[PDB]
Amino acid sequence: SESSIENFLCRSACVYMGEYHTTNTDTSKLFASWTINARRMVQMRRKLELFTYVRFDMEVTFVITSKQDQGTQLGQDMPPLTHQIMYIPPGGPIPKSVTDYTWQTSTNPSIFWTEGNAPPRMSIPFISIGNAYSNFYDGWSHGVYGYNTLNHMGQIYVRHVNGSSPLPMTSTVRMYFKPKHVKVWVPRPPRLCQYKNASTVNFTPTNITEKRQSINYIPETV
């Protein structure tokens, strides 16, 4: 009952933590971004690799905390801060500044949230023109080995929702991810070697198991 597929896979986890400012002199530090896949979380990756094909919905919750920068200026009286969390489907426009037009496109779903309230949450369906996702692909992208374009799942972007000339602030977002209504096909053996990077199956050769003293050795009984 605890070994069913749902109870084994449907569990929440922190998969990305990022920081972003209201004012800066880099302009890439003004927003945070994440590409959705399940290959940079080493514990979820291994449980997912026991199968060849998967199908699930996604649920994402966001925990967001702010701070005034230790730069100099005190005595402030500020209202609570507002944030915008945008999801981009596969085949959507990507922003490059925080002032871009794509933060207003009608087909990118978006959430507006102010601090002090309950943590925000959105639910994404199975988004693929194929019939399942694949954890393993023995092919070419059209050319990269092992990468097929049916596994695109979208992106998430987060910014502040101030007006003009805002006050300096630093925020941190943590994303909690959970698959739901899961189905799996074609079981596989468990990964025996350590993972080396996030896109390949590359590995250094590993021992089959650890040694004992002799082929007869059994430890003394208590």
Partner 1 sequence: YTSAGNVTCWYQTGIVVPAGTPTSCSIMCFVSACNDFSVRLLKDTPFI
Partner 2 sequence: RVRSITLGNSTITTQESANVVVAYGRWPEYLKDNEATAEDQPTQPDVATCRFYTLESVTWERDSPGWWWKFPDALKDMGLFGQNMYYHYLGRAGYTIHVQCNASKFHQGCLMVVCVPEAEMGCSQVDGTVNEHSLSEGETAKKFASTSTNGTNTVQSIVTNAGMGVGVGNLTIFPHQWINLRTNNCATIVMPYINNVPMDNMFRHHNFTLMIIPFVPLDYSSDSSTYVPITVTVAPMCAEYNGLR
For binding to partner 1 (CB under 8 A), which residues are involved? 2-3, 7-8, 42-43, 46, 191, 194-195, 216, 218-222
197 forms part of the interface with partner 2 (CB under 8 A): yes
68 binds partner 2 (CB under 8 A): no
16 CB-near residues (< 8 Å, 6+ apart): 34, 173, 174, 175
Nearest to 136 by CA among 123, 124, 151, 125: 151
Applying CB under 8 A, does 204 fall inside the site for partner 2? yes
Place of tokens 């399942």: 132
CA angle 67, 70, 74 (to 5 degrees): 90
Give 55 or 191: the residue with its C-beta nearer to partner 1. 191
Residue partners of 124: CB distance under 8 A and separation at least 6: 57, 58, 59, 60, 87, 153, 154
Residue 125 binding partner per list partner 2, partner 1, none, with a CB distance cut-off of 5 to 8 Å that depends on partner kind: none
**Which of 131, 164, 165, 213: binder of partner 2 (CB under 8 A)?**
131
* 196 near partner 2 (CB under 8 A): yes
With CB under 5 to 8 Å by kind, the binding choice for 46 among partner 1, partner 2, none is partner 1
Asked if residue 49 lies in contact with residue 191, where contact means CB atoms within 8 angstroms, the answer is yes
| CA quadruple 32, 21, 117, 114: dihedral sign | negative
In DSSP terms, 63 is beta-bridged to 174
User: Is residue 85 within 8 Å of 63, Cβ to Cβ?
Assistant: no
Cα radius of gyration rounded to whole Å, the chain: 22
Angle at 60 between CA 62 and CA 46, to 5 degrees: 115
Query: Is 146 one of the binding residues for partner 2 (CB under 8 A)?
Result: yes
Query: How near is the Cβ of 4 to partner 1 at its closest, in Å?
Result: 11
Q: Which stretch binds partner 2 (CB under 8 A): 63-71, 79-87, 104-112, 139-147?
A: 139-147
Instruction: Select from 18-26, 30-38, 124-132, 165-173 the region that touches partner 2 (CB under 8 A).
Output: 124-132
* C-beta of 44 vs 64, nearer to partner 1: 44
53, 87, 126, 176: residue in contact with partner 2 (rule CB under 8 A) = 53
Which of 208, 215, 218, 222 binds partner 2 (CB under 8 A)? It is 208
Interacting residue ranges for partner 2, rule: CB under 8 A = 52-53, 130-134, 136-140, 142-146, 150, 186-193, 196-197, 200-206, 208
